């Protein structure tokens, strides 16, 4: 086969973008040690929400109003 002109250019443009991706990933703002523990409080709160939802399942209330409202099916003009 012969690679078409379009295919060669399209690949080059994608190569150039990835080159810039390499550059912007080379300058970390914080070192590893500084990072440790900086977000502990937020993470712990999140699981507490998850656990609370899991252990909250229970049946629903039942009301006299629902059962007795069925009688209105026979309402009329007297």
């Amino acid at each position: 086969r012969t690679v078409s002109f379009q295919a060669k250019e399209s690949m080059i443009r994608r190569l150039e973008v990835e080159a810039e991706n390499h550059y912007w990933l080379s300058m970390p703002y914080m070192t590893a040690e500084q990072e440790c523990g900086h977000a502990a409080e937020r993470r712990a709160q999140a699981f507490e929400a998850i656990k609370a939802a899991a252990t909250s399942k229970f049946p629903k209330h039942r009301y006299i109003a629902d059962q007795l409202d069925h009688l209105n099916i026979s309402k009329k003009w007297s």
């Binding site: 229970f58 039942r62 009301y63 006299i64």
Partner: protein
């Protein structure tokens, strides 16, 4: 039920079932550390609570003199 879900039931209630729910929540809340999960059945006049609290409720009801 299901082999792992434990509950306690108060059965022959007359009058305002909702008032009883509020009292039970206040009475049991300090022990658990949270508000108890409950179900109110208006048609059958019963109250259902998650977890075993039969002994405490029996003593509690005697104090009120029912």
């Amino acid at each position: 039920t299901h082999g792992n879900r434990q509950m306690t039931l108060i059965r022959k209630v007359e009058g305002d079932i909702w008032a009883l729910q509020k009292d039970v929540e206040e009475f049991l809340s300090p022990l658990l550390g949270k508000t108890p999960i409950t179900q109110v059945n208006e048609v059958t006049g019963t109250l259902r609570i998650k977890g075993y609290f039969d002994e405490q409720l029996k003593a509690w009801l005697l104090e009120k003199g029912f």
